[PDB]
Symmetry: D2
Subunit: 485 residues, 4 copies
């Protein structure tokens, strides 16, 4: 379509009149997010992100809305879009455009391009607008990314400019791939150096998620990582708290809002048992489900068995499982042949990445019929067997599609890491090369201590003899770099 404009701010959301509801919820998230509020007070005078022009691509939720206003509290200008077609919280997007001090007729916030229920075409357009700053002599100079979509637009964009052509999409490529090229091919017809000029301008990217960090590795190994990158995902306080315990919280929320199906007493299959696999399984156990897991990695599999779970393959467990949940971050986990053998009215969901863990393209062209129950709940029925399957969020993240994603105090951790990673890549750009980096242990321990204190946990303080005995400083770090917690 065409961006909305109002009082200096271009944007495109569902409804600005939701801003008042949003503001109330933001204000409440603030009291649950000490990672960001503590970062606001510390960096208030310094203004470390001044000059920064951050293009962000992360689910547009209340929690992100508090992160965005942490970045502007520290000097930055931002533009934003979501990273899933279903995860935008519309009242959040609207509080963000309107700002703490504006009204919907006079918005005083930041540009936002997101709404719940985008098509694939609307998602890539919203993307483009987030990356395309209004003065051509001042492009995006930082990226905050989730799952690697922004970075993939710029780096593929550039790689097709440099080559003078965008390749025509093969028929058997995702329909999102067809859409992605169309955006660049149509852009290239008019502007030949657009993504090149943005790439050469961006001083670093901070990436939130495991799947995004796998893409960052494939760019650096091919030699195309065109700017420094921080792996925020693998901070101890991100991966072992947001990936695991945010999920222990929000799988349950996703499933309860989608279905009115009992968890306890049912057979649940969790695919993959990494940090997201771990949390899915612990929530289900705690609700008294009969859990089984799949894994490729014998270490991760031995962990499952020790925590009380059968390790099995999909084809062994599929036709008896009541609830099936993919959490591997890999493709082609649950296929049409598997869906076809699922019990009647079994629940299928993905909590990992994109929509390729579950074979959605195969299911659509199989001859099953779909009845939409409500947004992001669809019942599919096979005429030959008579059996039906409930599918959540069209195979895309069910905790963000069917619910609200992880609670506020969990994102306080993940986003404290994101704020810290932006400061260090902006103010210290000189010390980093075009490779993937992780934040030092002290910064990880900084963030955790904030939350330990907010919870009321009373840390023991080492004596001088005890620090000497351990080979550590009283103030930390307390552990070796390889330490696994």
């Amino acid at each position: 379509l065409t961006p909305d404009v109002r009082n200096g701010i271009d944007f495109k959301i569902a409804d600005l009149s939701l801003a008042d509801f949003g503001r109330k919820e933001l204000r409440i998230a603030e009291h649950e997010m000490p990672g960001l509020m503590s970062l606001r007070r510390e960096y208030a005078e310094v203004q470390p992100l001044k000059g920064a022009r951050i293009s962000g691509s992360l689910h547009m939720t209340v929690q992100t809305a508090v992160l965005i206003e942490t970045l502007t509290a520290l000097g930055a200008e931002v533009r934003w879009a979501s990273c899933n077609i279903f995860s935008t919280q519309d009242h959040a997007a609207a509080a963000v455009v309107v700002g703490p001090h504006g009204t919907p007729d006079e918005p005083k916030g930041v540009p936002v391009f997101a709404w719940k229920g985008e098509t694939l075409e609307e998602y890539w357009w919203a993307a483009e607008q987030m990356l395309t700053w209004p003065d051509p002599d001042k492009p995006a100079n930082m990226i905050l990314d989730d799952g690697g979509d922004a970075t993939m637009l710029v780096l593929r964009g550039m790689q097709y400019e440099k080559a003078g052509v965008v390749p025509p999409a093969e028929e058997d490529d995702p329909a999102e791939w067809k859409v992605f090229l169309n955006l660049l091919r149509t852009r290239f017809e008019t502007d030949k150096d657009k993504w090149t000029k943005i790439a050469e301008s961006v001083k670093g990217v901070t990436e939130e998620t495991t799947t995004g960090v796998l893409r960052l590795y494939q760019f650096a190994a091919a030699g195309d990582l065109a700017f420094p990158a921080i792996n925020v995902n693998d901070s101890v306080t991100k991966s072992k708290f947001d990936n695991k315990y945010g999920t222990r919280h929000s799988l349950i929320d996703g499933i309860n809002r989608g279905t009115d199906a009992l968890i306890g007493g049912k057979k649940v299959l969790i695919c993959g048992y990494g940090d997201v696999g771990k949390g899915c399984a612990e929530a289900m156990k705690g609700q008294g489900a009969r859990v089984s897991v799949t894994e490729i990695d014998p270490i991760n599999a031995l962990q499952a068995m020790m925590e009380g779970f059968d390790v099995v393959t999909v084809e062994e467990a599929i036709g008896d499982a009541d609830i099936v949940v993919t959490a591997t971050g890999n493709k082609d986990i649950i296929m049409l042949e598997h869906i076809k053998a699922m019990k009647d009215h079994a629940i299928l969901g993905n909590i990992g990445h994109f929509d390729n863990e579950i074979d959605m393209a195969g299911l659509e062209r199989s001859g099953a019929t779909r009845v939409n129950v409500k947004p992001q709940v669809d019942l599919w029925t096979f005429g030959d067997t008579g059996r039906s399957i409930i599918v959540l969020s069209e195979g895309r993240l069910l905790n963000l599609g069917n619910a609200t994603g992880h609670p506020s105090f969990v994102m306080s951790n993940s986003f404290a890491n994101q704020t810290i990673a932006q400061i260090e890549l902006w103010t210290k750009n000189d010390e980093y090369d075009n490779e993937v980096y992780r934040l030092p242990k002290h910064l990880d321990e900084k963030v955790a201590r904030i939350h330990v204190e907010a919870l009321g946990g009373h840390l023991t303080k080492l004596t001088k003899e005890q620090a000497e005995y351990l080979g550590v400083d009283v103030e930390g770090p307390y552990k070796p770099d390889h330490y696994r917690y």
Copy 2:
């Protein structure tokens, strides 16, 4: 307020057009409810309930619609009303008026008087409409009650018609008591034998929850139970499953939809540790919460400590609690002095009974300012401390007000008990005196069997020598009458 009437059906709901949506979730729900679906098969030809005119007072949820259409499949005529002002699922209510083979233009289901977010005046108007059948010759001849507001309206209704006067409300009476008395008083100045006529027509009551069953004990003690009552609550497959595992599910959902407070790592105070208290503590402990309990009973209290919870008074733990849940079925549990001691932005909710476990009158009278966040969530702020708390559903059942109540498969237990109870009191009425009964053990066992079979469990069968050793029939019952499971 006047009832709507299409194709001979009087009703008052939120929106008929929601029926399609409702009907889709009712069909899904029938697949989750083997207990009720078994009973429709079994008694289809017998029509055991032909001639029944059942007035029901019970949360008008999707689970409850599956029940109502069970009673009608078994031959009954029913009229319905919710028993909480927040508990109606308007799409459920719509599906029920319209019936499996009707449409909103030509509905073919049953009279319903129910919408989400009724006022106290609308609530009681509804109950009267539900108890008042079209033909003054054919009143209600059966009651289905959840909490005892249908039984109270009839039994007190007749008490005041006999005294020849409905007393004034004292100025300190509970607002619902005054609203309730205003109903009986206004009916009496036009119709002086109304409640006596229905009370003498009513062949029996089947009662759903603990609180309702206590009322039934106090009417029977005072000589004032005018009809047989079955205590469905204390069916084994109801008390130990609905109250415990149902709540383990639906406590989480309520807090998740109301807030985005993380549960893991948080200090949670459960008040009361009977079966609702036992579900609440197990839901929270499985999400990582540090739980403590309050109890008056030394036995329940010793059970709590043996499952790893501190047993404390509200006085000593209120200031530290991140979430406070009241689950006692008794009043005066969390007083204004206690709300005022709560940490800034803590969560207060009740999952027990009515609205008086929490001092909601005192809170509302106190001078505290209320800001409404969204439906059933309010933030209250004290200008003396500067602290706020979040209160869910105005102090009323949080699981059915903020979310949707216990999930379907649980409610197949409760409502197969309720159907079985209505078949018994209707068809064997001669055999019952005017007092409180509980169902026979073999009936509990038959209910549970359905559910074990549906989930896929395999029950062992006793040989003739083991049945003999045990002193039991191979087909049960298997336990002494005092057995506690």
Copy 3:
């Protein structure tokens, strides 16, 4: 054998020199057994049990030691025998014979006829020794019993006396039945009226375990209960604590002493999900095990599924099970054919009753080879499959045979029930008929309160208005009598 006699106390134990070790652990246990130490204090001056001559059949442990010495503190005379051939803890029996003030040279305690590792013959000789008081004018006038063996001697012995003959055993009879029949026959020669005299003298029996109480229920239905009986098993503070939270303690101890098998990660099969079964499953799940349950009762079977356990048959699960535990109180659970199907080096144990849950006579006669590894551990090998299984305590109670049984504090609940039952039946004998009984709610509540105050927990006291709301006294009882906790 011939009883030993020193300082006028007849006895027969393993080694009196253990008394010293015995006394320090007895004293240790007192600090852990509030219910018994409180009763000693309350009824100190009263001396309620003066005149009592208590013949007790109960596992001769440090816990029981504490009981025996409670009953003597309150006035009674006692004589004791274990109720399991392997349960005696010989240092505890030493200390009971020597008494708190005696020495091995000059004992000042009570007659004990117990050692660890008895033969069936020694077992029953010990039984008759404990029931046979020195003075023919002053027989036993009370029985404290666990499993019903002492009651069985008196009542069957009295049956053959009134009939004039003790019958022949058939070659089919179990080894212990033929030894039981042997003892009574050999006595009917020199003493025609021994047991009739004791039945008439016995004022009542108190019975500690589920299986004992079944035996009593069967004596009452056959019109043969010669004296009142108290079912201590089915006190709330016994069944719901000892049967379940004691087993959750002692099942684990028995397996760790018998073997060094990891529990975590292994498949476990628990036969029976009553109270002992519910505690077994709970132990294994908190240690990491993959637990499945077998059951005949569909209610108990559905409680299992809701706590995260498949309900399965022995036929379908026996070959996958690393540990098999029987928890039924029924005979014929694990037969020869099931043992032969067990995987190599799997552990078989029984925590229920006697030794016929496991087909131990089938095994012993099968052709299999036994290597004794150590006391109460044996490896049995099938020359035809070449597989070996480990059998704990020869199929008798694995928690008392291989370990020390339930811990001190759990037994303070069960044994304060027992002391209270003995005071009731002795000092208030007139109020009890010749049928089976359970203690009054208030007496259960008294027991729980003692142990709740000892653990640090704080009960809330009902206000006068809250007590009326509920229709209970501020001091209780607090629950209806069918109440299930």
Copy 4:
């Protein structure tokens, strides 16, 4: 002032050789639970990779270790063994080891062992020296397998005092073990002036089993006093995340249950430290229904603690009403006499970490409290001024091993599998290794894991050619980046 037994060419010193029939029974049973070790015997039998190895071992002398020992010898090694703790030796295990699968108490056919449960500190360091002192002066120890770094410390400190030419006088205020350690090296330096230096030349590598052992290994290295290559066995994922945590979940319960008859559920339990060993302690108690609080110095460990449902507190604020207190820090001075005086009457105190210094046993024994021994490794300590008593397990030394029998077999299958691979690699590939602390590669860590998964019956998924490609891993693994924390 004590000298070895010698029979059939074996020198040794144990409790009772007549316990060998019993021990062999338990050993064969343990083999069925240890496929990590049984797998390596099969893979490497034909090749015999440890030929020429003469391994001095200092690791608790348990059934579990017995299978380790008899695995190292199936692979060609010669071994001499002693326990690393004075209370952890299982006598019947020591016997079956000396006597071998095929010998007899009169004609033993196994390996020298210097170990009995309940050694004095003089007998511990004497057994250590023997274990390290091979019969042929030409051929001393050429490999170490150590647990907590006591063997490594004798060799390196021994050496250090030979080169300064004086074993230094023990202070007035030094741990009684330190006084006993020096006294050993000073009596020997009289009659042999280059004993330890010759051994340190001959030792080609050490493999260290435990977190405290590795702390000490890190300190020698920074001193530039690490004389030989060292493999950090503790820090494999399959040792650290399965022995330290899930082993302790099992055997903490066993220690407390054998020591006392105290119910765990319902009680207030306090765990100091929340690393791998602290996390297993907590999980065990939780699952027993305990009311658990933890202490921590590290805020990351502390936040994990709270997310699993535990108050995070200090000793001083929780000590007064804990029913059970367990230290798992591997750091010193956690429970001082002041804390002990504050504990509830008949409360339990134990140590599951290291040595004897987590708990102030030196201050406790000099305080005027009186001691009554209940049974081995159970002592009741009573304070005259309060009337109060505490139960102390294992004199403040490893309770899982002192009061019970250590981790179950299937748990050690993982640690000792990591130990057997460590020894193989450091012997057959010694030239690749500098004098530094080293960890094993991920594929060896996944190979150990795969052995046990498959024993337990877990069925892993196999990646398609396209799946492995997307992840950028080979089908056969490794599956995870090197920073990955599991």
